[PDB]
A paper describes a structure:
BiuH is structurally and mechanistically different from the ‘canonical’ AtzE from Pseudomonas sp. strain ADP, which fulfils the same physiological role; i.e., it liberates a nitrogen atom from the triazine ring and allows further degradation to make all three nitrogen atoms bioavailable.
Depending on the structure and the chain, the loop containing residues 44–53 is at least somewhat disordered and has a higher B-factor than most of the rest of the protein. The average B factor for the chains where the loop is mobile (in more than one conformation) is about double that of the average B factor for both the whole of the protein chain and double what is seen for the same loop (44–53) in other chains where there is a single conformation.
Author numbering:
A (entry chain C), C (entry chain A), D (entry chain D): 8 to 233
B (entry chain B): 6 to 47, 53 to 233
The structure:
Amino acid sequence: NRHFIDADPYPWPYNGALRPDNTALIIIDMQTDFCGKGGYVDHMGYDLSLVQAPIEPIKRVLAAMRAKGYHIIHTREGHRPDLADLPANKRWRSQRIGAGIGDPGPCGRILTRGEPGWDIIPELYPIEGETIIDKPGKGSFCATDLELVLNQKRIENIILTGITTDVSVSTTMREANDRGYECLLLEDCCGATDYGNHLAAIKMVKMQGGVFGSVSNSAALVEALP
Amino acid sequence: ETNRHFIDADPYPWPYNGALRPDNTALIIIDMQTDFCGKGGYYDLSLVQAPIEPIKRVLAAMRAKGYHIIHTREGHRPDLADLPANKRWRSQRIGAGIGDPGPCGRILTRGEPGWDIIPELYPIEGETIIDKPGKGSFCATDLELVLNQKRIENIILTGITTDVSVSTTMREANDRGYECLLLEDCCGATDYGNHLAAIKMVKMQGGVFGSVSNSAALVEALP
Amino acid sequence: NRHFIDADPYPWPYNGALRPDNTALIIIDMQTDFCGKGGYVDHMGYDLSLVQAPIEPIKRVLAAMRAKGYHIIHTREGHRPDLADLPANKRWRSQRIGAGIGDPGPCGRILTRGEPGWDIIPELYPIEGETIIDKPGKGSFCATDLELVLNQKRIENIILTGITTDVSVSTTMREANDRGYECLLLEDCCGATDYGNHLAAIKMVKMQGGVFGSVSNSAALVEALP
Amino acid sequence: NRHFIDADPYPWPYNGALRPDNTALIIIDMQTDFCGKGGYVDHMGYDLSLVQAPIEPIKRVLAAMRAKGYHIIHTREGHRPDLADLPANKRWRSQRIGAGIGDPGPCGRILTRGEPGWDIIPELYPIEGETIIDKPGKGSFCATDLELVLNQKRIENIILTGITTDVSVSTTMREANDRGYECLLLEDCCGATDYGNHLAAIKMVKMQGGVFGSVSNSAALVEALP
């Protein structure tokens, strides 16, 4: 029994092997630091409405996938309080633009694990049974146990959502795809610091017959999810 | 006194800390392979051929000053043991099936003439070649191990395509703490707008993936 | 200018480049689950005195290295409460011998993160500025950020201590060594489920001119540490 | 549909899911450098009879597993001819004992890819369709594509053979086990530089209800292989 989600450039997953047991949702970096007042992204002066836009669509996808027993994974980008996992270049760049990782702000130390700004927003909070990946980079595979977790759960398909489209979401999709995972990006469930870069990161997926996977949207996914 | 040097770059002069030396810096030339950019293989080559002469100039300058040089080739073992099923299916669907015969041999298959690096940018002895089964040069390779034994800190990225293997390689390197410079006239893509956008993505958030420069600025300031 | 610790089969580190800035202590898995009453190792019926023996020697090494400003790393083997990072074989084997990972015991769920038995023992507890690695396997590199952290700190030399000698300690040493790190095993600062396997894991290091590194002891280290 | 091989400490694989499509033999480092006159191990003065002993048992296992269509994997430890993948400590230790990696010997440059001494021995040579892993370390996973290959082949179970028991074989088993692969070590199909270390590496597997997997022998495997 095959099932597909209408998607561009091909119906997804490629082979129609779409089941709760072999499919995970990943919700990438929906943290106050990336989409809320007083955090990292706000300190850089970007338009928060672009990264808040995906909240309600993700909420709908999350509710549907929880109700149908799909695996749910959440990521949080951040650093130990001792900053041992913070590259010096990453830190310096953030300080140069007045959004220093580990520096005090209105929601605590920016992008620092255990601080209020770093946590996942309440609207998309994890519940019992859902894996949280704490990552020190943009890619969710680099220096984490995500791959190990996917393999123990025998996950083949990944549905990607979160922020930002062109940074953590795209990097995560590229890493997953290289390792053979079959990935669907939900375009209304991501957002970026620049709308043009958001659209372009989406278009990049579709080139060469779906070089990184395929693209769909929250309504299409929720309507056809088995 | 200080050995501090910078290349003019956007959004910040690179490398961030000015620690720019032959011993801690590599050029990487990504996937300049016959099937993707050379006369015959695997219609429009113009956008992926454009970077050849700028890369040639950067390569010559960095060789002359004793910098580390690294080359990549995307490809698969001839038995296709390292080829994901989704990757294969997609390539077949668009009539460019990995491992299938084409005019320069089996497409994206190691040891085939089309898969090799173009003669204009061919490696010489002492330059490491990374053979990779994915877009990112770190995934399933020994690149990280090699960088670490050479104590490389700074990487200058060139090659094709800007938005696929180049960008992915830059993101992987960046996440691991490497300080990366993308040379915008030394890369190209299948779609010029995606090329420009992959470049712009580097610069956001004060240089989220590193910084961006060009062949002339590099050659003018390389120590 | 060069400094060496007396060690077998060669004075360590190989090149004498021994400094606080390029050297870390790692204290592996000194958790109640591995060395205390009521935990995983106790449930399997092994002799706790073998894995408690290293506590005082480690304490001495830790005090000396803290006082001289060396980087300090601690590991904890364990699993998320949802057990997503627990391989099915690992779990089955632990259940078959009556020491089931995730199953309730006198110190909480065995080898489960957040449970009392899982935490590092108070005698060797981390202080601020010391990195903790949470690992789902025996090797400290597998599915962790340890390599990322070592690289940002520019660590070249690693001094290994903890438990068990032949399992997590040896595996960690082998991983580190393969990646080019220069490793010293402190033989009186480790212990095992079997004393003979402890001795054998130590001897394995020394073969082929120090195939995994070199071997010393707490007193030799403390006496010559720069 | 379940099938088991008689093994210690438990019948293997744990769940009986033993099939040609999900099971590989790995033959580790059966190269002239490790078991032949004039190579690396011979230069260090170790007794070649210990590392030659496993050749006939491996030959039998290889023949049986080829005849039944199981996946076959081979490894070779070695270095790129420019030595870009050779750690400085690894090189220094090999030079100190008169067996310098990359230095000329009677079978070519020691442990250097493309040299006669480095190649797999004729008695156990690969045939087409059997993946060869070229590794710069002891562990077959470190800096290779082995994990990617195993995952695309959907391999779950690995049968380990080769040399040396306590170095490359044990390291590879520990890496695989940590990632959730189900591993069987064939004790008569490995050997080491020290017989006691060989026996101890085997015994280490069996502790804690099969901490690294299980242990059997060539005859038991061949008799019960489905």
